[PDB]
Amino acid sequence: AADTWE
Amino acid sequence: AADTWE
Amino acid sequence: AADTWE
Amino acid sequence: AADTWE
Amino acid sequence: AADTWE
Amino acid sequence: AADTWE
Amino acid sequence: AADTWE
Amino acid sequence: AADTWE
Amino acid sequence: AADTWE
Amino acid sequence: AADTWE
Amino acid sequence: AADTWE
Amino acid sequence: AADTWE
Amino acid sequence: AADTWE
Amino acid sequence: AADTWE
Amino acid sequence: AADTWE
Amino acid sequence: AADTWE
Amino acid sequence: AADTWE
Amino acid sequence: AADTWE
Amino acid sequence: AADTWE
Amino acid sequence: AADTWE
After folding, report:
1. Which residues of I touch K5 (CB under 8 A)?
2. What is the DSSP letter of O5?
């Protein structure tokens, strides 16, 4: 799983 | 943004 | 699954 | 499951 | 924001 | 599980 | 911020 | 930012 | 597990 | 796992 | 800051 | 910053 | 385990 | 494991 | 600062 | 700064 | 174990 | 293990 | 400062 | 500064 944001 | 999971 | 947005 | 918001 | 769980 | 926020 | 656990 | 886990 | 913040 | 941010 | 434990 | 663990 | 901060 | 920051 | 223990 | 342990 | 600080 | 800083 | 023990 | 131990 991966959770990305700025 | 992205949230990827299974 | 994937959930994407800005 | 995933719950996303700003 | 993101909350991911199973 | 993962819980992310600013 | 991120909290990751299983 | 990125949080990656399995 | 990991818990990160500023 | 990896958790990255600035 | 980071707290990592298992 | 990066926190990497398994 | 490791706990880091400034 | 590794935990890096400035 | 860092505190590392197992 | 870096803290590396296993 | 190690505990470091300034 | 190694813990480095300035 | 550093305190190292096992 | 560096503290290295095993």
Report:
1. 1-2
2. -
